[PDB]
Design a protein around this ligand. Sequence first.
Ligand SMILES: NC1=NCc2ccccc21
Ligand SMILES: [Ca+2]
Length: 223
Amino acid sequence: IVGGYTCGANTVPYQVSLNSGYHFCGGSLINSQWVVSAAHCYKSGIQVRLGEDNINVVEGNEQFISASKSIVHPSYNSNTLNNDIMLIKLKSAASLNSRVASISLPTSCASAGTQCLISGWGNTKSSGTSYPDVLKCLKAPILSDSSCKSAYPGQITSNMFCAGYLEGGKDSCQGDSGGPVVCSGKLQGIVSWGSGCAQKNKPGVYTKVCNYVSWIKQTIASN
Ligand SMILES: NC1=NCc2ccccc21
Ligand SMILES: [Ca+2]
C-alpha cells in the first residue's frame, strides 16, 4: 500500500496473509472455512495466516492453518487477469473472534464514488522497494468505468474496476495482491493489478467480486 497508513493491530480482522515460507499475497476470510484471494496468487502448499498484524512477529492472536484445496475460477485468464479470483479452503475451521472475522459478500455491485478500505502488506514506495511488517490501510473511492478504461485502454473487462486517485500518490502495490477492497461492509474487490504503483492516471485495478457471488456460494456449498 502506497500513501496509506498503519491500520492498527487486528482492525481489519478479515484480512489474511498467504504464506508459502514467506508472505506472498493477501486474502479475505469469508466464513470459518473459506478464504477469497486472487487467482494470480495460486500456488500449492499455501498456509493461511489469520489474526496477523506484524507478519514477522508472533504477537499472540494468530491462527496458522494449511489450505486443503484451492479453486481457481474456471474462466481465469492469466494473460489478461480476467476473472482474477480463487477460493481457498482451510483444513480446519478458523476460530472466529474479534480479531479473526469474516467479511460479507456483496448483495449487489457498488457505485462509482463509494469509499472503500484497501489493505495489505505490500510495497509502500512508488519508486523503489520497502515492505512493511505491519498491515497498511488506504481509503479510496471506486472510480468511474470510463476513467478506468481510459487509463488502461483495451485491458478492462466487466469483471474489473478501478479504485484510487487519478492524481496518484495513493494506491495498492506488489504484495497486496489477493487482499480486500471493502466498501460499506461488503467485499467488493480483490487487489489484482496496475501499472506501477501510485502513478498519475494509473489507478489500481480490482476484481469485481459482485459478479462472482453466485459462483462463490455454489462452489463453497459443493466443496
Ligand atoms: N495497484 C497496483 N499496481 C501494481 C500492482 C501489482 C499488484 C497488485 C496491485 C498493483
Ligand atoms: Ca504476527
